[PDB]
Each structure stands twice: as structure tokens, then as C-alpha cells.
């Protein structure tokens, strides 16, 4: 069974700029674009995880998407952390890809929120965080996450604590993790790199993010601060992509360079 849901997709306008600003200064995103939207959603969820239920949907352009709804209410600012994290990863990955150090390209799945609405008057408008909370609360529902459907053989490549999948090693992913820390000047590290690999393309989902600032990604269970960053680097070996990029090493690195895998 499936029915129509109408409402608003909420994204961040000018994401590149806002992320670049969020990263350089210390100031949260305070700008959210609403776009009226209508999908067909299944009634029965086809999967659950620890925290939420997963429904198949079609978005109107005909794309296969997944709608995710949480088991019980979570406040907006928590859901927003997942979105802010995803937009950091996409922003980092786009830059990294553009370096053209590797024939493999990284794509984190887009995440946005959706809220059901009888009305379309916020369509095309940018709202503040407070205004977004009021539009969510007018609904009295926790918003859903929406992301493109991903099929294929799913693999966890690097966890958020120094573990490495050895038989599915790709040097592009390890150099990416290392580089995220270089590009953000030691502030953060992207790991929990996992998803699907097809035709030189990694479709990646649910990454973790370690931040040196305790006050920064406060809800994430997978953020392990400076300790997480150290854990990654203890087992990290700079590979031919790290070398090609001249990545300076974290001081916790002890192991010698390796030259297996890409390039």
C-alpha cells in the first residue's frame, strides 16, 4: 500500500558557502530553504535500524528515495546535526574529488528533512532556525529524513575508532580521511566511511565525524573528539594518494607508508 504525502523538503541554501562559513568561524547554520513537495510513500516500512524506520518512496521526478522516521520524538537541533554532518562530508568530498588525485570519486548521499503540510505558503522561502522550529512544531511531528535509495553490496570500510577493513581496502578512502583533517586544520576527521562501490564511484552513507571542540557535534554518539582522531591515525599508513597530496602526518602516526591500492 501507498499514499501521497505533501509538504516541504528543507535544505540549506548556498550550502558550499554556509559550510565554508560554519567551518571557518564558529557559527551554526541559521538558514533553511523550504520547497513544497509531493511523494508517493509506502505504508509498510521495508527496514528498521536502531533509531528509525525506513519507507520506500518516489519523489515526483520519479527518483527512488527512502523516507526515515524516528521511533519517538527527537528535537529538531538533533536532526540538524545529522544534516550538518552530511553537508560537511559532501563539501569535503566535492573538493577532494576536484583534486583529481584518484580515478575513484566519493559521493555522500544527500540528506534532507521533510515535513508534511496542508499548505504551500513557505515554498521557495528561506527561514531562520527559530522559524524552521515553528514550522516543524505547527506540524507536531518529528520531521523525516529523505535520501536517495541505495542498492548494491554495502561495506563498512573504516569505522569511527581506528579499525580498517583490510580485504576491501581502497587507498582513496584512507587518503580522504587523512585529508579531511588536513583541510580543516586539525579540527575534525571524517570516518565511518561505508557504503557501496560501483564504477569508480563510492556511494557513501552515515559517516562519523570527530571534532576537537567538545561543544560542536554534541548529540552524535559516533563523535569521539580528539581521541577518535588519534585512534584513526594510530593505525593509518600514508598511502600513495596521501604522498601525492603531501599530507602532513598527525603526530600519533607511527606506521610506515604503504603503497598498495590505487595509484
Ligand X SMILES: Nc1ncnc2c1ncn2[C@@H]1O[C@H](COP(=O)(O)OP(=O)(O)O)[C@@H](O)[C@H]1O
Nearest approach, Cβ of residue 60 and ligand X (Å)? 18
Contact 201, 104 (CB under 8 A): yes
Residues 151-180 that bind Zn ion (CB under 5 A): 178
Instruction: Determine if residue 150 is labeled as part of a ligand binding site.
Output: yes
* 50: contact with ligand X by CB under 6 A: yes
Q: Which does 242 bind (CB under 5 to 8 A by kind): ligand X, Zn ion, none?
A: Zn ion
What letter would DSSP give residue 115?
E
* 149: contact with ligand X by CB under 6 A: yes
Which of residues 158 and 238 has its CB atom nearest to Zn ion in the complex?
238
Task: Find the part of the chain contacting ligand X (CB under 6 A) among 7-15, 16-24, 44-52, 90-98.
Answer: 44-52
Q: If you write DSSP's letter for every residue of 20-72 in order, what string do you get?
A: HHHHHSS-----EEEEEEEEEEESS-SEE-SSEEEEEEE-SS--EEEEEEESS
Contact 198, 170 (CB under 8 A): no
Contact 213, 184 (CB under 8 A): no
* 168: contact with ligand X by CB under 6 A: no
Contact 152, 198 (CB under 8 A): yes
Which of residues 12 and 238 has its CB atom nearest to Zn ion in the complex?
238
Which of residues 191 and 238 has its CB atom nearest to Zn ion in the complex?
238
Contact 220, 180 (CB under 8 A): no
Question: Bridge-partner residues for 203, per DSSP?
Answer: 107, 196
Positions that interact with Zn ion (CB under 5 A): 178, 238, 242, 247
Positions that interact with ligand X (CB under 6 A): 47, 49-52, 54, 66, 68, 147, 149-150
Residue ranges of the annotated binding site are 50-52, 68, 147-148, 150, 178, 236, 238, 242
Amino acid at each position: 500500500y501507498q499514499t501521497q504525502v505533501s509538504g516541504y523538503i528543507i535544505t540549506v541554501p548556498n550550502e558550499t558557502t554556509q559550510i565554508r562559513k560554519f567551518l571557518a568561524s564558529n557559527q551554526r547554520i541559521n538558514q533553511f530553504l523550504f520547497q513544497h513537495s509531493t511523494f508517493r510513500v509506502e505504508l509498510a516500512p521495508f527496514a528498521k535500524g536502531g533509531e528509525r524506520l525506513a519507507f520506500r518512496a518516489i519523489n515526483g521526478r520519479g527518483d527512488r528515495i527512502v523516507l526515515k522516521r524516528f521511533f519517538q520524538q527527537r528535537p529538531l537541533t538533533m536532526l540538524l546535526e545529522t544534516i550538518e554532518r552530511q553537508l560537511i562530508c559532501i563539501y569535503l568530498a566535492n573538493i577532494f574529488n576536484k583534486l583529481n588525485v584518484s580515478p575513484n570519486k566519493l559521493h555522500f548521499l544527500p540528506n534532507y528533512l521533510f515535513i508534511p503540510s496542508p499548505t504551500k505558503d513557505l515554498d521557495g522561502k528561506i527561514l531562520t532556525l527559530e522559524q524552521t522550529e515553528q514550522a516543524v512544531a505547527a506540524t507536531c511531528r518529528t520531521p523525516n529524513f529523505v535520501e536517495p535509495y541505495l542498492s548494491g553490496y554495502f561495506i563498512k570500510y573504516i569505522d569511527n575508532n581506528g579499525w580498517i577493513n583490510e580485504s576491501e581496502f581502497h587507498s582513496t578512502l584512507h587518503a580522504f580521511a587523512h585529508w579531511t583533517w588536513v583541510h580543516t586544520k586539525g579540527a575534525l576527521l571524517i570516518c565511518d566511511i561505508q557504503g557501496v562501490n560501483a564504477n569508480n564511484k563510492f556511494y557513501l552513507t552515515d559517516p562519523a565525524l570527530h571534532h576537537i571542540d567538545q561543544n560542536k557535534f554534541i548529540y552524535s554518539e559516533t563523535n569521539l573528539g580528539e581521541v577518535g582522531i588519534s585512534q584513526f591515525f594510530r593505525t593509518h599508513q600514508c598511502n600513495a594518494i596521501c604522498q601525492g597530496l603531501h599530507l602532513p602526518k598527525h603526530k600519533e602516526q607511527v606506521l610506515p607508508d604503504t603503497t598498495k591500492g590505487t595509484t
